[PDB]
Symmetry: D4
Subunit: 222 residues, 8 copies
Amino acid sequence: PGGRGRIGVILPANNAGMEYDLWKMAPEGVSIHSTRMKPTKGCEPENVEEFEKELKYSYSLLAEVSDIIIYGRTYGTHKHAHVIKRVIKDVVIPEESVYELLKKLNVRKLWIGTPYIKERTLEEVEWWRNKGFEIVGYDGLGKIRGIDISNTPIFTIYRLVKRHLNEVLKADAVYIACTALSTYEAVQYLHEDLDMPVVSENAAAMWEALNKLKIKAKLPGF
Amino acid sequence: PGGRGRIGVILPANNAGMEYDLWKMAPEGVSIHSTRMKPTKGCEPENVEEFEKELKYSYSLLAEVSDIIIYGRTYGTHKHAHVIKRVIKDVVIPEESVYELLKKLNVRKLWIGTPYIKERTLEEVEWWRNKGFEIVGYDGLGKIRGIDISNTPIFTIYRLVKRHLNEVLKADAVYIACTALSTYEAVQYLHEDLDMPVVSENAAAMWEALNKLKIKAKLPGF
Amino acid sequence: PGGRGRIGVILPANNAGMEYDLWKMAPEGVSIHSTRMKPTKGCEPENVEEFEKELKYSYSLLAEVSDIIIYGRTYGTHKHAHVIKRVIKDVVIPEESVYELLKKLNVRKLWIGTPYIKERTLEEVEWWRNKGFEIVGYDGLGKIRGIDISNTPIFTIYRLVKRHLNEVLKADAVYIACTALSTYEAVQYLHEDLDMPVVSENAAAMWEALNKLKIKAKLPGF
Amino acid sequence: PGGRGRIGVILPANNAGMEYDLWKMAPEGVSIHSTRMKPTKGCEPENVEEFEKELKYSYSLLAEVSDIIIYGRTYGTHKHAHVIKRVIKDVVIPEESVYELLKKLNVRKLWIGTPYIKERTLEEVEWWRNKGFEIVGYDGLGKIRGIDISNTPIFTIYRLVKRHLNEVLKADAVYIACTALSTYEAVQYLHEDLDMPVVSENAAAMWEALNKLKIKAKLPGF
Amino acid sequence: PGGRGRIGVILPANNAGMEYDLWKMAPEGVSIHSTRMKPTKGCEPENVEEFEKELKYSYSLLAEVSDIIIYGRTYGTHKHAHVIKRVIKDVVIPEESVYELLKKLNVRKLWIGTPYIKERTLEEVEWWRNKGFEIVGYDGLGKIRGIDISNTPIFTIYRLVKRHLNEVLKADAVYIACTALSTYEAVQYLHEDLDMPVVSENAAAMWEALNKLKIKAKLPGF
Amino acid sequence: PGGRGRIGVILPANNAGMEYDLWKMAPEGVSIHSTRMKPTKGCEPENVEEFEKELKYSYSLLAEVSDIIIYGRTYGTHKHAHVIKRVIKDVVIPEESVYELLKKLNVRKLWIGTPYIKERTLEEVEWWRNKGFEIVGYDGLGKIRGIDISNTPIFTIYRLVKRHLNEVLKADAVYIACTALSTYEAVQYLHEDLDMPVVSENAAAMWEALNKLKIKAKLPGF
Amino acid sequence: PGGRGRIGVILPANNAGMEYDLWKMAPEGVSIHSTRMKPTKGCEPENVEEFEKELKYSYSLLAEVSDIIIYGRTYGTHKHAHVIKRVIKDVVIPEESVYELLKKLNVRKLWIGTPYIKERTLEEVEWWRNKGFEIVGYDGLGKIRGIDISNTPIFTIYRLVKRHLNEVLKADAVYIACTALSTYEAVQYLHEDLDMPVVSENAAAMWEALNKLKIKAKLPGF
Amino acid sequence: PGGRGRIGVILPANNAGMEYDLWKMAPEGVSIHSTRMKPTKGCEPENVEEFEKELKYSYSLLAEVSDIIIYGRTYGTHKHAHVIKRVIKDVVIPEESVYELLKKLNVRKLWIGTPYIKERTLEEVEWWRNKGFEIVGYDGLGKIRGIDISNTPIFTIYRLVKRHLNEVLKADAVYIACTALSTYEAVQYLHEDLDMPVVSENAAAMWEALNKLKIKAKLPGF
């Protein structure tokens, strides 16, 4: 029973990494409660009313046990963030959390690691690039299926970044995209070794949620 | 990542105690993945096809990330267990787990603790009698709302039983119903103090799941 | 054998939280010794000589084993503090300890949490405002019986405050009234989460006592 | 809160050792609550109605917070135990606890250590002898004032016994009288070194109390 | 210094897992010393004199710092074990260690896990079958390059076996071939979960070496 | 599996101290991989092509499992360092690491400890003086055989320096030559006691290697 | 075997507290070696040649195993310190160590605690008083026999000082005389509670010895 | 303070290993007090009255602080043990302790390790044979000076025995002579590895002393 706080999380059916990260980061007295959503074809809502209806439903399943809710998907966050914010009051959108965290950390140069194939990696890059960050470098694991992404080993994530040391060192911080990756440990190793903030999407999400709820906690990587 | 094993769990929207218990019991390398279901009026589905359709849907959201699935509700387990077993192959029904565990523990005399009101506590008590157990005593917390049940403090659960020490010491074991109660700690204290197995629905569920997956683990209470 | 120090405490018959708090806060080599007083109707003595006679008696039971004595009641502290100070030389009055502690902490804005019901909580609010504090907010558990108050769970005390986050954040510190509440843990969680001193009556009492005796110690919440 | 159990204790004003022992022995979730009684001239009440009236009063101060009560005095236990049992239902009389414990331990030969002077040590001796125990030896610290007795150092109590190794090794167990002595540690050292049960009055009292309440616990010298 | 013992190990150039396993298993005061050998085409030497000459050379590099030597390759062990034993007195051949260990464990039914491709896994199979073991099942990771094999994650090795729970549970023990795999952890998880000895080639090698040197030690899966 | 990093090391056949030091200093996720070289007569190669050919061969045995390589010999480092750097790109030469470390530590006055005999210790002294250091003092263990050197006890190395306290205190740092000495512990004791950096050849080597790979770590002695 | 250092100590036959203190303070790798001297009538040598002859003899028994020697007596230190320094080169005289330590701590006001009776306590006071310290207060345990002094309990030493809190607080530091008292613990409690250096003769002696030998160590009380 | 017990020890001037061993073995509350004796030429006193006079003197220096005394020399124990027993009542002679311990351990076959040269090792070996033991083997460190003996490293003592594994494994136990050797650790390693009691002279001495005083303790090696 989360007497200190209860965090609800809506995530994709095949995401097997976020729940683990969230619990590992949850301070004493805090509990995580999740519900899943149908896996989707694209990365954005085809039918907005359809999306909003399903979103409201999942939200209704978490509304009473949650003190705050995290939208743990990337789907619909780029072009329909307003729909999500509309349905879920005070919702935490990991991608936006990353932005605030990086800003609060005075980050201008960024190195981006992802689990995606080149194409998506680049889009991810341009997204952040189009938000004012200078992207000194990037790379991806070249995966497609979420379950496969979730299965990524700690050090595979670690070497994904370390392999580009020379350029990684030119950044003010590193960002590891996708909530399907369990970055709880990887991010700590990277942070210690690179001596710079290493921000994962899951850690950023917890950072924002814990701040809004006002619960002291030492997140990993920064 | 749940390299050692991944346990999926389907639970009622307002259950805030089972996810906590499950993670506390999860041995290293094991992760818990859940999805919620619409809260229902009765304790048994009035539209079977409706139930089966919703059940199949939730199952489809956990099917890929799960190595095994736990049906963490009481709803539909008394009269429609066959429907659940049909939709979810190898599904773990906590109530049935309790039965197997008690049997394996050679339990004949039983004391039953619940979070329900007198009328429902009576049904619960009669149910286990009609299963071959001599019920030396019982009591309930007299609650109705699941969130309220989930909020039950460790020692409130502890005194729920201890208050009837004289009856209790006549049983071969104690059983604490409902997966909404977080019994991880309470059950350990009771087990040590009463010197007899104290079986909670959540512990029984993990016991069965961990056995089927073949993962060593020390559950609490027994 | 409190070779380092012995603290005597006079408390109401039905107070079950203060002794626990005091021992948990007692540093190594320090021991707590208590004696109880007849539970009373009002919150102030109608017969002063009666009060003084009973007060002197209880004091006589603690005088020889105590290095210092804490008057752990609220009864008679508002209008007859002088009587208490008269009978018990160097007595520690928790309510006055809170005042000195808050002052030493440069506190001007205060949020007050209590276990009482509307009326009495309103009197407590007024009592602190007249002492020179701006009371940005308050709330109570609405209890009457001391044993009931003592039974209050850690997180029930925690949420009593957290539920009013918006206002609490406007204060310089939080104060939790009544020595019947066991605040040893609750106060630590609140202090960490709110990032401001959270002063409970029991912690304030120990603070003053330990200072007078000159025994190093880390009290909780500030 | 003492969700696991609350033990009330009535003790003499100048006893500074039993509260410490009781708390050290208290398992998690158990709390100790005490109240004192006027120090008396003799070792037995001269006015029975007077005694019974004061006894009932102190009891009334502990009745509501206690699950069980320990009468931590020797006063009135030899000739008026029935009065005490009458006023306090299920009361635990340390001296009687020692007897049951020694019997349960199949003890026939006993060595007795006390904090009293020769005269009283002698009375303590034939009192236990009169219960059928063969008393292979004894000795006392020769103290009179309770506060002085309470101040007795761990190893002073240890050497009080060890100094008579010769005869002491002829007993089946050692018994250390008076609840004013803090025997929590001393008794452990003696038990390990002499390889036989070393029963102190405080440990015996907790043993009986914890048994009646049914709370698992590992007591000091046996 | 390895005052307790020094174990020398000859291994293939690209083996990155055995040195790690050996050190983790090395008890206090024991140190591991290694030297590498040219990577070879086949799995058996084509030129025996060539092999023997290179073998003697590597041995000469470890002879002075070693108390015993482990031949950590599979190359030349199937058809030329006698050559190895000839050059290196008391040499420990991991494959032969596995055999002795399994025999000492009274193993008749065996499940075999390997990192090789179907073809080679099949050869590894009937080789052990040819030693009288009934092989209830097997599987391989289908890898070729040693460095790739060494990179195998703990749980990848764990699931390599667990995925065949069904048949695996019919064996008396599990055997994981190749010293390039770091099985220190994987083997412990499997052993606990399957409740049967899980023997890795590296653990078997250390078992034999530590026995000959007579150094107490608790090895991984048995 | 050095998921964090893999350090290869080429060392003399009879060196039994460096591998131990390296592993003790290796942070989590880092592994050490070594290969030996034929013990040589002189301290410099008489046949350069011979040396280069053997050097290239050993390197080829470590090239694939290593992220970086340490040349753990003194042989050929004084007059043929360029040959080594040529064959092994980014190779770490412990002697040169010591120089950079001492420089980074702003060291001008140096005390030198060695395991060699008068003559050779004299050559080492001259070698460091020509590098720009004032050598306030020195001493050696007077050993010749590497295995003998490796067998040197922690405190023998400690007293080798401490015995000259008066001079040592005049230096800015102490340097202990030869990678055959296991200095992991000795260097820590010396550093604490002398309150100045105590640099061993092995620690310096790890310092440089870990820096190039960018892996956080706390080496001993400085 | 004190590889890090060996401290010899000459002490009075009946001193049972210094050896314990010295070992408790001895850092790892340091050992204490002692030899006793005939107990004497006065506090100063009657026959100087006699003293010097016996002193030289005891010294000869410690000369070879010691790196430095501590003269753990007060006898002959006030008027014949020069004789001691003459016989034992670099000898550590605890009383002189206290002086240097207090000076290095910029101490002007001092509170003195001793185990002696009034007369000696006063002489001790005048001694320090005649060395430039302002003695804000003092007290003694009033003991005569060294064995009795050695038997002094931790908290008896603690209260010896604490009992004079008001004046103790006026000092810059507290000094506890006599090496027969085991002050290892007492001094730590006092130091923490009084928030000022609390210097015992034994701690001062170790401070000086460890400094001369150059061995890092955290002495208690300052 | 040695509230639990005080052990006095008389040892040779240059013995630097026994005091360390004794303290490491001393259980909590036990302290060691020593005094030294003039180093002697032979291994047996040539002037008995001279010996007895010096023996009585040293004894007089330890008589008051000791609960029991250990004669930590070999000198005079072979032919004049009766003189020692005469002067020191209940004295513990390590050599005799070894005998009783070995006997109590039902030891018939013995392997003997010593720090002496061949000739003295022969006497030592013959001595124990003429005591009823079959001596399956032996060896010595070949040292003469006690300080040199004391300086013997843990593993040097360990290999002294291990080097003769084949002979050793034929014995029922191993015995390591001389109290100058610090065997506290060495003996534990040997005991674990050889799986048989490994008795050092110092451990045997403590065993006997602790038994006579009746203090529970876990010695090493057996």
